Design a protein around this ligand. Structure first.
Ligand SMILES: NC(=O)c1ccc[n+]([C@@H]2O[C@H](COP(=O)([O-])OP(=O)(O)OC[C@H]3O[C@@H](n4cnc5c(N)ncnc54)[C@H](OP(=O)(O)O)[C@@H]3O)[C@@H](O)[C@H]2O)c1
Ligand SMILES: NC(=O)c1ccc[n+]([C@@H]2O[C@H](COP(=O)([O-])OP(=O)(O)OC[C@H]3O[C@@H](n4cnc5c(N)ncnc54)[C@H](OP(=O)(O)O)[C@@H]3O)[C@@H](O)[C@H]2O)c1
Ligand SMILES: NC(=O)c1ccc[n+]([C@@H]2O[C@H](COP(=O)([O-])OP(=O)(O)OC[C@H]3O[C@@H](n4cnc5c(N)ncnc54)[C@H](OP(=O)(O)O)[C@@H]3O)[C@@H](O)[C@H]2O)c1
Ligand SMILES: NC(=O)c1ccc[n+]([C@@H]2O[C@H](COP(=O)([O-])OP(=O)(O)OC[C@H]3O[C@@H](n4cnc5c(N)ncnc54)[C@H](OP(=O)(O)O)[C@@H]3O)[C@@H](O)[C@H]2O)c1
Ligand SMILES: CC1(C)N=C(N)N=C(N)N1c1ccc(Cl)c(Cl)c1
Ligand SMILES: CC1(C)N=C(N)N=C(N)N1c1ccc(Cl)c(Cl)c1
Ligand SMILES: CC1(C)N=C(N)N=C(N)N1c1ccc(Cl)c(Cl)c1
Ligand SMILES: CC1(C)N=C(N)N=C(N)N1c1ccc(Cl)c(Cl)c1
Lengths: 249, 248, 248, 249
C-alpha cells in the first residue's frame, strides 16, 4: 500500500539524501548503485531497520552500450519485483569529468557522460512508462548548464539533453498521468577530489549565504515535485542554486 | 507567528494564497483595491479561526506620484498589525489587451504599474523595513515567451517582473531575503471570458485538459516560502500543466 | 527612392554607428537626440555632405510622461515629413544608472522604464500605425539574466524590451513588419568609467578579452534590416564575444 | 588564398543551399554526404564548372559507433588535403524520426539520432580545432526545441545537446579565435513525402507570411555568421523561424 520509488546513484551524497527523505515520506525505495556496493547495502540496512522490507539495492552500470536498455528495464523491474509497483523514478546518477576539445577513448567518454546523464534517463523513462495515482519522474539537471565549466563539453551536452528529455517526456507522458520535472542544483556537495581552496572559491560565489547547498536542500525540492502539492506541475525545472546562476562573470 | 502581505488577496488566486498561508500559521494582510466587501469577508473567516491574525489594507497599485507612499503603507500595515513582515506575495495584476494598431498612458500606469512597478516599490519597502525565513514571491506568467496576441503591455509588465525577480534575488541575498516566482498558465479563467473560449484553453493543457485550481498555485507559493526552499532564490516555478511545452 | 530609418539616441556612440552604417547602406536617416544637440547636428551635416538631403535631426525626451505618446508620434512623423516614408525604426536610446533597493523614485521609473521600454512601445505603435522591407530593431542587453547588482529598474526595462520584441513580432507579422533585437554584452564602455574598471570588464570577454566596437554592434543591426533576414522576426542576436556564457 | 568550408549533409535541401551560398561567397567546399552520392557528385560538378577545383565530396555515415571519431577526423582531413586549410565547419546533417516512449532497435535509434545531431558535431568540432583568419563553426539547431513534437524525444535530446555543444565549444575555442554559433530554423523545407494538406497545416501557423523558410533563407543566416560582419558573435543561436516559436498552443 506504500508507494515505491527508484533512485539512481543513491548510495552516497545527493542520491542518498533523496532516498532517505523519500523513505521518511512513506516510500519504499530501490537504491541503485554502480560501484558503491558497501554504501548501498549499508543504507538499505539502515532503512529496513526503520521499517522492514522497505528498501532493496540494484546494481547497474548506466554507461551507454547495446545492453543499456536491458539494464534500465532491470532497474525498473527490480522495483516491481520487490514492491509490486513503481510510483516515482529519480534520475540522479551522473558521470562528470573534463573532455577538452583540444589536445579512456573518446567513444568511452561519450558512452559514460552521455549515457549516464541522458540516455540512461531516457531508457529508464521508457521502462517506467511501459510498466505502468501520483506517478512522477524527477531528473537531476544542472543550474549552470548555460554558463558551463570550460572543457566539460560532453557533460554539458548530456545535461542539456536531459532538459530536452524532461520537456519531451512531460508532454508525451501527461495523458498517462505521469509528471516529469527537474531539479537543477548549482553548487551542492563539492567533488571529494577537489582541494579546499577550490571548494572555498566556489562557495564564495554563491549569493545566498556564500555556501554550497546541503544534499538535504536538494532532496527537499525533489520531495515537493513528487508530492500532492505539485500535481499540476510538469515539464518544470526548479533551480536550487542560492542565486549562483544569476551572477555575471 | 510570522506575517505575510498578499496583494490582490480578496479574490481568486490571491485569496487562495492568503488562505493557505493562514492555514500554515501566518498572520496575513489582505490587500485590496476595489474589493472591500470580499476582503473583509475573508478577514472575518480567518479571524474566526484564530483571533486577530488577519487585517485588510486598501491601496490602488496604479503607478502615479503617490504609488511609493501607498506601497510603503501596505508594508507598514503589516509591521503595525503584527510587529514583523516575513513574506511578501506580489499577486495583484491588471490584464487586458493593448493593440499596437482609457488613454494609452493610463494603460501604461495600470499594466506596468500593477504588474511591475508596484512589486518593485513593495520590494524596496519590504527590504528597507528589515531564525527568520524572509522571502518574496512574485506571480509571473508561464506564457511570457509565447504571448497572447495584442497583449504587449501586459507581456512587457510580466517580463519586467521576471527581471525584478532576478535582480532582487541577487541584491537581497546578502540580507537573507529570497525572491522567487510562481508562473501559472491557465488557472482560474477570467470571469468575463465566455464558456466555449475557456474550454478551448482547457483542451490544450497536457496534464488533464483542465485549468489549475487557485489552490494548486497557492501550493507552489507555500513551498517557496517554506523551510524546504531555504536555498532557492531567483527561481520561477511554472505551474501550468505542461501548457508552455505545447507547440502551435 | 532610398528607404528611410529612425535611430533613437543616434548622436554618439552605438546609435551614431548604426545611423552611419545605415546611411552607408543607402538609407536616409532621422538622428534622434535628447541633450546631444551639437553632436547630432554635426553628424547630420557629415552625412548630408556625403549625400545631400539624406539626414535630419529630431529632438525628444523619451522619459515616460503623459506627453510621451505625442513625442513618439512626432519622431515617426519627422521621418515621413523629411523623406516620405519610414522603413526602419532602431530603438537605441537608453538611460542607465543604479536604483538600489535598500531624483525621486518615480522620476527614476519614468526615465529608466520610459527610455528602455515604454518609448520603444509607443514608437512601435506609431511606426506601425503610419504604414517593402519594414523592420524594427531594439537594442537589448545580453546580460539581462545575469544583471549588475543595484540596477533593478534598468534590468526591468530591458526585460520589458525583450517582451515588446516578442509581442510586437507576433502582432506585426501579418503587416510584414519584422521586429528583432540586438543584445550587446560589453561594447563601448561608459565615458565616466576609469581605465582600471574598463579593463576589469575587458578581461572577462572570452573572444579577444576586449569590448565590441560600435561598428560590430551596427553590423548586426544592418543584417537584421537587410534582405538576408527576411524570414527573421522575434529573434534577439547576442553580440557579446561569449561574455554571457562565463560563469561567476 | 580562398578559404575552405566543410558542410555536412550537403547533397540536398538546406545543406545544399548552404554549400552553394558559401561557394558563391568565395569558399572552396567539401560536400559531405551519406546516402545521396548522385546528388552530391552532381553538386560538386556544378560548382567545379563555375570554378575549377573548388568542390570535392566526402562520404561518411555519422551514426555513432567505434569508428565515428576516425570518420570525423577523415572529413576534416579531406578539406585540408583538397584545399590546404579549413576555415568553416557547418554541422547540418541530421536524422529525424519518432521514438515513442510508449508502445530499428532503440540503441540503433540512439546512435543515429544522438550521433548525427550531437556526437558527430562534437567530434567534427574536436577535429576542426585540433587541426588549426576568420575561423568559425555553425551548428544547425531547431527553433522549436522547447516546444517539441510529440514522440520525438531522442531527436529533441540530440538538438538540445547541440545547443550545449554550441555554448561549451564557443567558450573553450574563443581563445583560439574560433567562433561557434547556431542557426535554428522553424519550418523550412517540408519532408518530401508530406501531403500538401499537411504542409499547409504547418505553413498556416507561421506569423510571418504563413509560409516555410526557403533553404536559401536559412543559408543567408549561416553566411552572416561566417562573415566579417559577425566577428564578435560567438555562442549565439539565431532563430530563423518567421515568429513560429512565439505562437502559443
Ligand atoms: N553536487 C553538485 O554540486 C551538483 C551540481 C550540479 C548538478 N548536480 C547533479 O545532481 C546529481 C547528484 O550529484 P552528486 O554530486 O551527488 O553526484 P555524484 O556523487 O558525482 O554521482 C552520483 C552517483 O552516480 C553514479 N554513477 C556515476 N557513474 C555511473 C555509471 N557509469 N553507472 C551508474 N551510476 C554511475 C555513482 O554511483 P556509485 O558510487 O554507486 O558508482 C555516483 O555515486 C547528479 O546528476 C549531478 O550531475 C550536482
Ligand atoms: N488566473 C490565471 O490563470 C493566471 C495566469 C497567468 C498569470 N496569473 C497571474 O497570477 C496572479 C493572480 O491571478 P488572478 O486571475 O487571481 O488575478 P486577477 O483576478 O485578475 O486580479 C487579482 C487582483 O489584482 C487586483 N488589482 C487589479 N488592478 C489593480 C490596481 N490597479 N490596484 C490594485 N489592485 C489591483 C484586484 O483586486 P481588487 O479586486 O481588490 O480590486 C484583483 O482582484 C496575477 O499576477 C496574474 O497575472 C494568473
Ligand atoms: N555600450 C554597451 O556596452 C552596451 C551594453 C549593453 C546594452 N547596450 C545597449 O545598446 C544601446 C546603445 O548603448 P550606448 O552605450 O551607445 O548608449 P548610451 O551612450 O548610454 O545612450 C545612448 C543615448 O540614449 C539617449 N538618452 C538617454 N536618456 C534619454 C532620454 N531621457 N530621452 C531620450 N534619449 C535619451 C542619450 O542621448 P543624448 O546624448 O542625445 O541625450 C544617449 O546618447 C542602449 O540601448 C544600451 O542599453 C549597450
Ligand atoms: N527543414 C526544416 O524545416 C528544419 C526544421 C528545423 C531544424 N532543421 C535542421 O536543419 C538542418 C538541415 O535540415 P534539412 O531538412 O535540409 O535536413 P534533411 O534533409 O532531413 O537531412 C540532411 C541530410 O542529413 C544527412 N544525414 C541523415 N542521416 C545521416 C547519417 N546517419 N549520417 C550522415 N548524414 C546523415 C542526409 O544525407 P544523405 O541524403 O546524403 O543520406 C540528409 O540529406 C538539419 O540539422 C535539421 O535538423 C531543419
Ligand atoms: C560533484 C559532481 C562532480 N558530480 C556530478 N555528477 N555532476 C556535477 N555537476 N558535479 C559537480 C561538478 C563541479 C562542481 Cl564545482 C560541483 Cl559543486 C559539482
Ligand atoms: C486571470 C487573468 C485575466 N488575470 C490576470 N491578472 N492575469 C492573467 N494572465 N489572467 C489571465 C488571462 C488570460 C487567461 Cl486565458 C487566463 Cl487563464 C488568465
Ligand atoms: C554604456 C551603458 C552605460 N549605456 C547604456 N545605456 N546601457 C548600458 N548597458 N551601458 C553599459 C553599462 C555597464 C557596462 Cl559595464 C557597459 Cl560595458 C555598458
Ligand atoms: C526535414 C526534417 C525531417 N529533417 C531534419 N533533419 N530535422 C527536422 N527538423 N526536419 C523537420 C521535421 C518536421 C518538420 Cl514539420 C519540419 Cl519543417 C522539418
Amino acid at each position: 500500500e506504500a508507494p515505491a520509488a527508484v533512485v539512481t546513484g543513491a548510495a552516497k551524497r545527493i542520491g542518498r539524501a533523496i532516498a532517505v527523505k523519500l523513505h521518511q515520506t512513506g516510500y519504499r525505495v530501490v537504491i541503485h548503485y554502480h560501484n558503491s556496493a558497501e554504501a548501498a547495502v549499508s543504507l538499505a540496512d539502515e532503512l529496513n531497520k526503520e521499517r522492514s522490507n522497505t528498501a532493496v539495492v540494484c546494481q547497474a552500470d548506466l554507461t551507454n552500450s547495446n545492453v543499456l536498455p536491458a539494464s534500465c528495464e532491470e532497474i525498473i523491474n527490480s522495483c516491481f519485483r520487490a514492491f509490486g509497483r513503481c510510483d516515482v523514478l529519480v534520475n540522479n546518477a551522473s558521470a562528470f569529468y573534463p573532455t577538452p576539445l583540444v589536445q579512456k577513448t573518446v567513444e568511452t567518454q561519450v558512452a559514460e557522460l552521455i549515457g549516464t546523464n541522458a540516455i540512461a534517463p531516457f531508457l529508464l523513462t521508457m521502462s517506467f512508462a511501459q510498466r505502468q495515482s501520483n506517478l512522477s519522474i524527477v531528473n537531476l539537471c544542472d543550474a549552470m548548464v548555460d554558463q558551463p565549466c570550460m572543457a566539460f563539453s560532453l557533460y554539458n551536452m548530456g545535461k542539456h539533453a536531459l532538459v530536452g528529455l524532461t520537456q519531451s517526456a512531460a508532454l508525451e507522458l501527461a495523458p498517462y498521468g505521469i509528471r516529469v520535472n527537474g531539479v537543477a542544483p548549482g553548487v551542492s556537495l563539492l567533488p571529494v577530489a577537489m582541494g579546499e581552496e577550490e571548494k572555498d572559491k566556489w562557495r564564495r560565489k554563491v549569493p545566498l549565504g556564500r555556501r554550497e547547498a546541503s544534499a538535504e536542500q536538494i532532496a527537499d525540492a525533489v520531495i515537493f515535485l513528487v508530492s500532492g502539492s505539485a500535481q499540476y506541475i510538469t515539464g518544470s525545472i526548479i533551480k536550487v542554486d542560492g542565486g549562483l546562476s544569476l551572477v555575471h562573470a
